[PDB]
Amino acid sequence: EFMIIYRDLISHDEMFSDIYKIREIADGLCLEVEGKMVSRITGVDIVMNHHLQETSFTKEAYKKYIKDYMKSIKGKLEEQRPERVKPFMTGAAEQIKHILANFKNYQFFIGENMNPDGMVALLDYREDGVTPYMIFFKDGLEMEKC
């Protein structure tokens, strides 16, 4: 019955909803959302459905951005879920290293409001080369349900 909407905790933008196959990955740090190409005008269904905007980054610019972004999420956790801080930080350090190491594989998308402090979702494709999937930071999302 219910449908859950995932909103960017910092920018309040709607990021996605549970109408897609969602998997928790990176030991609970991220949510991987699988989508489909929709040519209605080609595009990823997740991006079109939630009005995500594609953006671009130099690696050095992205590196500065996610460290500050993850630290802002750490601040929210210290306030709302203190026990989550340590595993979040350890996982964040590892995931940041992972994203930087595979930096060129991704396309970057932000919420409709395009708040520079908001989350930047990562898009890449499955091995079939046609099935898109997007990565979001679980702790940077708030759930809304109805």
From Swiss-Prot:
<dbReference type="GO" id="GO:0009615">
    <property type="term" value="P:response to virus"/>
</dbReference>
<keyword id="KW-0597">Phosphoprotein</keyword>
<dbReference type="GO" id="GO:0005509">
    <property type="term" value="F:calcium ion binding"/>
</dbReference>
<dbReference type="GO" id="GO:0005654">
    <property type="term" value="C:nucleoplasm"/>
</dbReference>
<dbReference type="GO" id="GO:0005881">
    <property type="term" value="C:cytoplasmic microtubule"/>
</dbReference>
<dbReference type="Pfam" id="PF00838">
    <property type="entry name" value="TCTP"/>
</dbReference>
<dbReference type="InterPro" id="IPR011057">
    <property type="entry name" value="Mss4-like_sf"/>
</dbReference>
<comment type="similarity">
    <text>Belongs to the TCTP family.</text>
</comment>
<keyword id="KW-0106">Calcium</keyword>
<dbReference type="InterPro" id="IPR011323">
    <property type="entry name" value="Mss4/transl-control_tumour"/>
</dbReference>
<feature type="domain" description="TCTP">
    <location>
        <begin position="3"/>
        <end position="146"/>
    </location>
</feature>
<dbReference type="GO" id="GO:0003723">
    <property type="term" value="F:RNA binding"/>
</dbReference>
<keyword id="KW-0963">Cytoplasm</keyword>
<dbReference type="GO" id="GO:0042981">
    <property type="term" value="P:regulation of apoptotic process"/>
</dbReference>
<dbReference type="GO" id="GO:0006874">
    <property type="term" value="P:intracellular calcium ion homeostasis"/>
</dbReference>
<feature type="region of interest" description="Required for reduction of TSC22D1 protein stability">
    <location>
        <begin position="44"/>
        <end position="146"/>
    </location>
</feature>
<dbReference type="GO" id="GO:1902230">
    <property type="term" value="P:negative regulation of intrinsic apoptotic signaling pathway in response to DNA damage"/>
</dbReference>
<dbReference type="GO" id="GO:0005737">
    <property type="term" value="C:cytoplasm"/>
</dbReference>
<dbReference type="GO" id="GO:0043066">
    <property type="term" value="P:negative regulation of apoptotic process"/>
</dbReference>
<dbReference type="InterPro" id="IPR034737">
    <property type="entry name" value="TCTP"/>
</dbReference>
<dbReference type="GO" id="GO:2000384">
    <property type="term" value="P:negative regulation of ectoderm development"/>
</dbReference>
<dbReference type="InterPro" id="IPR018105">
    <property type="entry name" value="Translational_control_tumour_p"/>
</dbReference>
<dbReference type="GO" id="GO:0140297">
    <property type="term" value="F:DNA-binding transcription factor binding"/>
</dbReference>
<dbReference type="GO" id="GO:0000922">
    <property type="term" value="C:spindle pole"/>
</dbReference>
<dbReference type="GO" id="GO:0019827">
    <property type="term" value="P:stem cell population maintenance"/>
</dbReference>
<dbReference type="InterPro" id="IPR018103">
    <property type="entry name" value="Translation_control_tumour_CS"/>
</dbReference>
<dbReference type="GO" id="GO:0070062">
    <property type="term" value="C:extracellular exosome"/>
</dbReference>
<dbReference type="GO" id="GO:0006816">
    <property type="term" value="P:calcium ion transport"/>
</dbReference>
<protein>
    <recommendedName>
        <fullName>Translationally-controlled tumor protein</fullName>
    </recommendedName>
</protein>
<dbReference type="GO" id="GO:0005771">
    <property type="term" value="C:multivesicular body"/>
</dbReference>
<comment type="subunit">
    <text>Homodimer. Interacts with STEAP3. Interacts with TSC22D1; interaction results in the destabilization of TSC22D1 protein.</text>
</comment>
<comment type="function">
    <text>Involved in calcium binding and microtubule stabilization. Acts as a negative regulator of TSC22D1-mediated apoptosis, via interaction with and destabilization of TSC22D1 protein.</text>
</comment>
<dbReference type="GO" id="GO:0005829">
    <property type="term" value="C:cytosol"/>
</dbReference>
<dbReference type="GO" id="GO:0005634">
    <property type="term" value="C:nucleus"/>
</dbReference>
<dbReference type="GO" id="GO:0005615">
    <property type="term" value="C:extracellular space"/>
</dbReference>
